[PDB]
Design a protein around this ligand. Structure first.
Ligand SMILES: Nc1nc2c(ncn2[C@@H]2O[C@H](COP(=O)(O)OP(=O)(O)NP(=O)(O)O)[C@@H](O)[C@H]2O)c(=O)[nH]1
Ligand SMILES: [Mg+2]
Lengths: 185, 52
């Protein structure tokens, strides 16, 4: 129990977009190429130190955060289970697959579900366009995704769970948003 | 077991792990008054702020 705050996030998006891979890359720095679809729900954890104003020196300033990162299944057979878990999450990592246009077109529907079921009508969400390493299979234009993200006022990162690009960025952003919300309130 | 049953078994194991984390967290929060007695910091650290 050597930490200061338990912060809970949830990853959501269509089946196959990379929710499990993104989280595993973040917490363990590892990646599995074989598709092992999530059985309803799972979570991962990571201990980090939040420093809002950058590095400290001799006097420790950081807030020790225990992250619980909920990992939801995308298949509709688990939709009621996964929706049940939206209300207890402090922030959301919403994913689509850069190689799958339909997963991107479904982003609006996922946002609508969060607005209904989350703790707030306007919860903190970071949008992740995943599988950026697969440029030859790319089907979603960066500008289109940015436009969408802009309309909702949400940050957009293009990520790769394969090599880790922008994963820590996206999650640290989400952490910053909720810690500032805590400061606000 | 059937796939139906195996699926519930797997999810139950996740829920059990979550329960253990929740109990650990609750025990941490219980001990906070030993070190921090400013109730606003307690509200923040305990996660009570998230429920207002
Ligand atoms: N090249 C590449 N492959 C990725 C990336 N992210 C995930 N994958 C691959 O895509 C497949 C699906 O990943 P997974 O994380 O299981 O997706 P999911 O969103 O958790 N699926 P579900 O909701 O069904 O559990 C796997 O074969 C995985 O290796 C990525 O950034 N790059
Ligand atoms: Mg998964």
């Amino acid at each position: 129990g050597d930490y200061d705050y338990l912060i809970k996030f949830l990853a959501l998006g269509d089946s196959g977009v990379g929710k499990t891979s993104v989280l595993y890359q973040y917490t363990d720095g590892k990646f599995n190429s074989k598709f092992i679809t999530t059985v309803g729900i799972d979570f991962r954890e990571k201990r980090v130190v939040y420093r809002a104003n950058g590095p400290d020196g001799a006097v420790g300033r950081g807030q020790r955060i225990h992250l619980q990162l909920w990992d939801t299944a995308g298949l509709e057979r688990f939709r009621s289970l996964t929706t049940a878990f939206f209300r207890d999450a402090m922030g959301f990592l919403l994913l689509f697959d850069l190689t799958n246009e339909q997963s991107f077109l479904n982003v609006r529907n996922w946002i609508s579900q969060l607005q209904m079921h989350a703790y707030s009508e306007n919860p903190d969400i970071v949008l992740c366009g995943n599988k950026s390493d697969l440029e030859d299979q790319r089907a979603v234009k960066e500008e289109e995704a940015r436009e969408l993200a802009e309309k909702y006022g949400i940050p957009y990162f293009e990520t790769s769970a394969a090599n880790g690009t922008n994963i820590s960025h996206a999650i640290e952003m989400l952490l910053d948003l909720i810690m500032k919300r805590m400061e606000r309130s | 077991g059937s796939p139906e049953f195996e699926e519930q078994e797997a999810i139950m194991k996740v829920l059990q792990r979550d329960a253990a984390l929740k109990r650990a967290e609750e025990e941490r929060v219980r001990h906070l008054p030993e070190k921090i007695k400013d109730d606003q910091q307690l509200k923040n650290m305990s996660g009570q702020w998230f429920y207002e």
